[PDB]
Amino acid sequence: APQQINDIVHRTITPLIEQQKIPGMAVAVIYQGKPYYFTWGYADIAKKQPVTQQTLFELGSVSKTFTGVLGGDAIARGEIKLSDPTTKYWPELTAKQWNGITLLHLATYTAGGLPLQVPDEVKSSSDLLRFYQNWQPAWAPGTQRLYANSSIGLFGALAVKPSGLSFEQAMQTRVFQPLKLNHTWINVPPAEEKNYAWGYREGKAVHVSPGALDAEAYGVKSTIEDMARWVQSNLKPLDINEKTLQQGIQLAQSRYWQTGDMYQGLGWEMLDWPVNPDSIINGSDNKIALAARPVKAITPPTPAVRASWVHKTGATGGFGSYVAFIPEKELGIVMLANKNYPNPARVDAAWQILNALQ
Ligand SMILES: O=C(O)c1sccc1S(=O)(=O)NC1CC1
Ligand SMILES: O=C(O)c1sccc1S(=O)(=O)NC1CC1
Ligand SMILES: O=C(O)c1sccc1S(=O)(=O)NC1CC1
Ligand SMILES: O=C(O)c1sccc1S(=O)(=O)NC1CC1
Ligand SMILES: O=C(O)c1sccc1S(=O)(=O)NC1CC1
């Protein structure tokens, strides 16, 4: 590998792993469009299994980037429109507070205060209906952003309804398969169990628990190789042969709302490049990332901007992941760890690496 990449990655990640007591980690750097891979530590401490380029990690909320792109693909197919009222796809949703809440609002967390999680009590389809029918918004639609699995999770479920496919079938056949992400899963199959890392939370081995809208909001597992390929595909969508998927990638990086220096895409979030590193690092802290923030509508949305820092953090109980890229520089990074360690540490390391290579 190029020594500059070797050196910047090792000198950044080694101390991170030590300081954060991360059991296992995989990193990919995409540099002038080519991936370079690095691994450390253990996928399974008890069984002494090392992290490899084939190890599966829980992506947590990085999954939202796949949901956003799948939704974009459905727009490009003419199956849905972001301007469609939510009720068009869920006619049983008759409660008056849904008037004016569109698929755009669901996808971008701007519906007016849908909650961070779907309640664990929701264990059926009728339960889910009751939950959304009874939810009372704090704010008018399109006025404030509040990061929420119940928001983008419902968007994902509704976006695939016209296709007739389950969310998992749609994702597999329309996103994973065309991009040759052959080791990326919503449900880990028995064939891949030997590669599925344990997550570690307070030293205990854990995997993500089932929940309503899990697939749509936080449910994807993938390897460092497939995630490198996901980054390549989002860096350079015009190289994708399937037209609707190329278009879906473009739509997911369009800029729909602004708060501070950040622009909200579908799943992806973006800042102008060059970025103030303090903006992305401090901004990634959940104390900020999960706050209720007033948004400026971008009317109409700005198509995907090349000179952007495009990124997404994600976690589950036992895993912590980060992906960032800069289309203008053909540069990107994926960091997958089997411990949920603080977001700002991820973004600081990612910026130190990409800044050195830019
Ligand atoms: O992370 C921790 O708190 C702890 S505490 C005990 C084990 C672990 S761990 O195995 O998950 N961490 C890795 C460095 C050894
Ligand atoms: O610009 C606006 O009108 C609005 S209105 C609500 C948010 C914003 S903003 O965050 O993009 N601008 C803030 C930093 C000054
Ligand atoms: O990108 C957008 O937001 C939009 S929204 C309408 C068209 C476009 S685009 O043509 O510039 N690029 C992708 C959709 C086909
Ligand atoms: O993924 C994330 O970063 C975030 S940030 C806020 C919620 C979530 S999540 O619910 O999907 N995962 C939780 C266990 C850490
Ligand atoms: O199981 C996990 O790791 C995840 S990942 C996202 C939520 C959960 S959960 O089931 O604990 N729900 C709690 C965080 C609010």
Domains of the chain, with CATH numbers?
A: 1-358 (3.40.710.10)
Nearest residue to 225 via CA among 75, 81, 26, 43 = 26
Report the alpha-carbon distance of residue 110 to residue 301 in Å, rounded. 15
Cβ neighbors of 208 (< 8 A, separation 6 or more) are: 58, 60, 199, 214, 218, 219, 316, 317, 318, 319
User: Which single residue is written with the structure tokens 């084939």?
Assistant: 54
Beta strands 204-206 and 199-201 are antiparallel
Q: How many other C-beta atoms are found inside a 10 Å radius of the C-beta of residue 326?
A: 23
Method: X-ray
Q: Residues 243, 246, 252, CA angle at the centre, nearest 5°?
A: 135
Please report, for residues 6, 98, 240, 241, 316, the alpha-carbon distance to residue 250 in angstroms, rounded to integers and kept in the order given. Answer: 31, 28, 11, 14, 27
Nearest CA to ligand 1 atom 7: 203
Tokens describing residue 191: 């064939």
Residues for the chain: how many in total?
Answer: 358
Q: Measured from the CA of 294, which atom of ligand 2 is nearest?
A: 6
Tokens describing residue 325: 């890229």
CB-ligand 3 contact for 303 (6 Å cutoff): yes
CB-ligand 4 contact for 116 (6 Å cutoff): yes
358 is in an annotated binding site: no
3-state helix, strand, coil in the chain (%, to 5): 40, 25, 35
Q: Residue 323 in contact with residue 265, Cβ under 8 Å?
A: no
Q: Residue 155 in contact with residue 216, Cβ under 8 Å?
A: yes
Strands (E), 3-69: 24-31, 34-44, 49-50, 57-58
Resolution (angstroms) stands at: 1.6
CB-ligand 2 contact for 294 (6 Å cutoff): yes
Q: Residue 68 in contact with residue 265, Cβ under 8 Å?
A: yes
Tokens describing residue 309: 């820092």
Nearest residue to 234 via CA among 325, 339, 150, 328 = 325
Tokens describing residue 103: 């698929």
Starting from the CA of residue 256, give the closest ligand.
3
Nearest CA to ligand 5 atom 2: 208
DSSP code, position 306: S
DSSP string, 137-148: -SS-TTSEE---
Q: Which of 61, 150, 163, 308 is catalytic?
A: 61
| Residue 83 appears among annotated catalytic residues | no
Report the alpha-carbon distance of residue 316 to residue 207 in Å, rounded. 8
Ligand 4 centroid–CA 268 distance in Å is 15
Q: Which of 63, 220, 316, 338 for mutating ligand 5's site (highest number of atoms within 8 Å of CB)? A: 316
Q: Residues 78, 258, 287, CA angle at the centre, nearest 5°?
A: 115
Question: SS3 for 120?
Answer: coil
Tokens describing residue 264: 């909200």
User: Which single residue is written with the structure tokens 């398969």?
Assistant: 177
Cβ neighbors of 229 (< 8 A, separation 6 or more) are: 35, 179, 180, 181
Q: Residue 321 in contact with residue 335, Cβ under 8 Å?
A: yes
CB-ligand 4 contact for 218 (6 Å cutoff): yes
